[PDB]
Design a protein around this ligand. Structure first.
Ligand SMILES: *[C@@H]1O[C@H](CO)[C@@H](O)[C@H](O)[C@H]1NC(C)=O
Ligand SMILES: *[C@@H]1O[C@H](CO)[C@@H](O)[C@H](O)[C@H]1NC(C)=O
Ligand SMILES: *[C@@H]1O[C@H](CO)[C@@H](O)[C@H](O)[C@H]1NC(C)=O
Ligand SMILES: *[C@@H]1O[C@H](CO)[C@@H](O)[C@H](O)[C@H]1NC(C)=O
Ligand SMILES: *[C@@H]1O[C@H](CO)[C@@H](O)[C@H](O)[C@H]1NC(C)=O
Ligand SMILES: *[C@@H]1O[C@H](CO)[C@@H](O)[C@H](O)[C@H]1NC(C)=O
Ligand SMILES: *[C@@H]1O[C@H](CO)[C@@H](O)[C@H](O)[C@H]1NC(C)=O
Ligand SMILES: *[C@@H]1O[C@H](CO)[C@@H](O)[C@H](O)[C@H]1NC(C)=O
Lengths: 244, 248, 195, 50
């Protein structure tokens, strides 16, 4: 309860706002208007490095002002256990509102305003041009999901096991046990179609010539490896090993 | 030769490839070798596929957990709701269990439908990337890797596809003095391809992406107008290949 | 929207977003498309515009001999963009629609707290102080089911809206890559006319 | 107490909302963090008449 500047009409007792929650109250004994504020609350996030790095953590009470709980106050809440440096680095652990945290150095946990990148000024001029004299060939990677696991559900078996007194009443919940099955079947067929569209894009099955000399370029890392039981390239084999 | 095709595609003449064939082959081989090391790293860049698998497993496990929940009934057990209660009360208890568990199924199916829509968006993106990065050379910017796209290679991965994008990146820039056009005889000459640059005293015409200077002649330039309207036109001489052959 | 519901601040402040757009603008002005493919290579802006005219199939001399007219047309068009964005309120209405939809969902949830849901009361304390606790469990359970269903449908609608927003953000990122960081040959992808 | 015989409903809802909240920041970064550096226009803002 706090003192309020509202101007209740002489007959009005309660006070409300949008969604109909009591925002103010007129005191019965002495005629005063008290604003009502909900008691503070909010999630408790734990900023931590890996347990392979340290067992030390910092605690962010988000939204909570740093009065209902070293103690720093960010627009995301209050931070406890992390020192706010005046430097700026790339974001390691995103806290929010432009504030990130990291495990740096006194090896401790620091919080800072994340840096957007190295500052650079381009030498613009009326008649100056920059032209490359050399180059590099860069191979980057993009990983893209194509499908998920196709799952079917036996609704009658799932709801209960061996039970006919189930099914007798469940029949009265008409068509709910087949709509879900139809949706799941559609999902599975769609997964198969996804794989078909992504990969089945060649009518012929082409083969590299027995001599893998392509002008000096070496494709052994991406070409199929006959040594493995599955004709998978070393990169494909590594990908299958990693994701398990 | 198709690498020269692709160099022409990105705007670089093919003699640049043919004169640097071994250097480019070595750079490509080194980058491909570094790919395997980069994949086998502690960030575990295979995050999307693992997240998909984990989301599916978590949804299935949550659906399993929802069975052992009373949902406000006497108990979540099948027989124990009948071996104890009478058929009248067991009827409403069974109704409670059925409503709760069918609600769990409906929620799971809805979440799976949303996730399948997201996966279909990703799969359509992967399909267009296969069509345009792998089956052709893409002029779209940053669609097929970062840089000037040269080519791409697909690799199957569990529940996904990995694209290795080979791109051409400029490396060692040099600063020069440039000019929109040059004057020879009261005429304005513009470069057919490339730009006019000066090393400090001479004027050459290069290609815009690689510094390969050539003498400004009437073969590299075309004439349009005069030295009156172009803002920044520079006096120079335009070599005529016909004069030495005709005089001799 | 503050009855157990919290609004988290975005990680990137508007200061940082403005900084990023300023960096993109400076790169486009001072280097063209070269900063989006590698190192930023300086190029006089008339020469970059001649590059772009050549890319839409118009020779360089057309720009160089019409440079003042083209500059004046660009300045006038930019001023008209300022004026047009000032007027016609339902022009930047997609962002307003997003904000209004989120506010509508939040307010619907909060005032759906007050629903009776078939129970004798919408206040837990009224049931706990008017009906005996041993048999108030049924009323409490039905209120719990109602509120759980309300929150579940809110979350599902938020997921659908987040999918829509993710599609929009993917399109915006593609447009930044292709129209801003380069020059696009795709028709009507980067506005009507030759980009 | 009654709520905690439901159990995984609330964990599901919290995880979904957290996923949406982190996806929003992913979207913003994916759109605006295109550039590796932070470029600045020169102190003289003359660009041929534009
Ligand atoms: C209640 O009694 C107190 C005691 O003097 C007095 O100050 C106050 O004005 C009274 N209020 C009403 C509404 O009678
Ligand atoms: C937290 O409360 C203090 C005083 O109680 C004051 O700094 C301000 O009201 C709050 N801080 C914020 C909003 O950053
Ligand atoms: C270009 O770079 C390669 C290595 O990337 C180097 O071997 C070569 O000498 C360089 N050439 C020039 C002209 O800079
Ligand atoms: C191609 O690279 C592999 C390493 O993956 C190497 O073992 C092989 O000898 C290379 N092929 C050559 C150099 O012809
Ligand atoms: C070219 O010279 C200018 C003059 O200071 C300089 O600002 C620019 O960085 C130089 N370009 C390089 C070094 O690539
Ligand atoms: C510029 O032109 C050529 C470079 O090929 C050379 O003969 C001349 O000395 C150069 N002048 C310089 C670098 O100042
Ligand atoms: C050289 O350029 C100047 C302007 O920069 C021009 O007045 C002069 O006529 C040019 N020289 C010749 C021989 O035309
Ligand atoms: C040439 O460059 C200067 C700054 O170096 C600047 O005033 C403008 O870009 C050009 N000069 C004129 C008079 O336009």
């Amino acid at each position: 309860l706090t003192e309020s500047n509202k101007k209740f009409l002489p007959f009005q007792q309660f006070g409300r706002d949008i969604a109909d929650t009591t925002d103010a109250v007129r005191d019965p004994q002495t005629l005063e208007i008290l604003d009502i504020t909900p008691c503070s609350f909010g999630g408790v996030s734990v900023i931590t490095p890996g347990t392979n790095t340290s067992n030390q953590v910092a605690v962010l009470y988000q939204g909570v002002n740093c009065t209902e709980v070293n103690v720093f106050q960010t627009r995301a809440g209050c931070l406890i256990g992390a020192e706010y440096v005046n430097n700026s680095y790339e974001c390691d652990i995103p806290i929010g509102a432009g504030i990130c945290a990291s495990y740096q150095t006194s090896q401790s946990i620091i919080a800072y305003t994340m840096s957007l990148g190295a500052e650079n000024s381009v030498a613009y001029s009326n008649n100056s041009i920059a032209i490359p004299t050399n180059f590099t060939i860069s191979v980057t990677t993009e990983i893209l999901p194509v499908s998920m696991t196709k799952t079917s559900v036996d609704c009658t078996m799932y709801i209960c096991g061996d039970s006919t007194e189930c099914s007798n009443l469940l029949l009265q919940y008409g068509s709910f046990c087949t709509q879900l099955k139809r949706a799941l079947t559609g999902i599975a067929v769609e997964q198969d179609k996804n794989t078909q569209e992504v990969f089945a894009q060649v009518k012929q099955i082409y083969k590299t010539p027995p001599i893998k000399y392509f002008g000096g370029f070496n494709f052994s890392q991406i070409l199929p490896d006959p040594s493995k039981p599955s004709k998978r390239s070393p990169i494909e084999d590594l990908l299958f090993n990693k994701v398990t | 030769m198709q690498m020269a095709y692709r160099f022409n595609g990105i705007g670089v003449t093919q003699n640049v490839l043919y004169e640097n064939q071994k250097l480019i082959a070595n750079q490509f081989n080194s980058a491909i070798g570094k790919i395997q090391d980069s994949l086998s790293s502690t960030p575990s860049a295979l995050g999307k596929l693992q997240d998909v698998v984990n989301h599916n497993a978590q949804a299935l496990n949550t659906l399993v957990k929802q069975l052992s929940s009373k949902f406000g009934a006497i108990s979540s057990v099948l027989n124990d709701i009948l071996s104890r209660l009478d058929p009248p009360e067991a009827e409403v208890q069974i109704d409670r269990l059925i409503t709760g568990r069918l609600q769990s199924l409906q929620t799971y199916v809805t979440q799976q439908l949303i996730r399948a829509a997201e996966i279909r968006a990703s799969a359509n993106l992967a399909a267009t990337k296969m069509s345009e990065c792998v089956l052709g050379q893409s002029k779209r910017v940053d669609f097929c890797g970062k840089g000037y796209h040269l080519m791409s290679f697909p690799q199957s991965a569990p529940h996904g596809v990995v694209f290795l994008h080979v791109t051409y990146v400029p490396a060692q820039e040099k600063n020069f003095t440039t000019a929109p056009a040059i004057c020879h005889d009261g005429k304005a000459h513009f470069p057919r391809e490339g730009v006019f640059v000066s090393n400090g005293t001479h004027w050459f015409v290069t290609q815009r992406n690689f510094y390969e200077p050539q003498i400004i002649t009437t073969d590299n330039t075309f004439v349009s107008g005069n030295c009156d309207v172009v803002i920044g036109i520079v006096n120079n001489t335009v070599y005529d290949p016909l004069q030495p052959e005709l005089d001799s | 929207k503050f009855n157990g519901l919290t609004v988290l601040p975005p990680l990137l402040t508007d200061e940082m977003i403005a900084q990023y757009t300023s960096a993109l603008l400076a790169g486009t002005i001072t280097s063209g498309w070269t900063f989006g493919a590698g190192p930023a290579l300086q190029i006089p802006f008339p020469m970059q515009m001649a590059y772009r005219f050549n890319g839409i199939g118009v020779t360089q001399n057309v720009l160089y001999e019409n440079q003042k007219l083209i500059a004046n047309q660009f300045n006038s068009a930019i001023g008209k963009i300022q004026d047009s964005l000032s007027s016609t309120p339902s022009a930047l209405g997609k962002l307003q629609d997003v904000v209004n939809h989120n506010a509508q969902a939040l307010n619907t949830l909060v005032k759906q707290l007050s629903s009776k849901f078939g129970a004798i009361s919408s206040v837990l304390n009224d049931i706990l102080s008017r009906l005996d606790p041993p048999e108030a469990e049924v009323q409490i359970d039905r209120l719990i089911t109602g509120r759980l269903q309300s929150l579940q449908t809110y979350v599902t609608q938020q997921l659908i809206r987040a999918a829509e927003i993710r599609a929009s953000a993917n399109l915006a990122a593609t447009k930044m890559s292709e129209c801003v960081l380069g020059q696009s040959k795709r028709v009507d992808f980067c506005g009507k006319g030759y980009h």
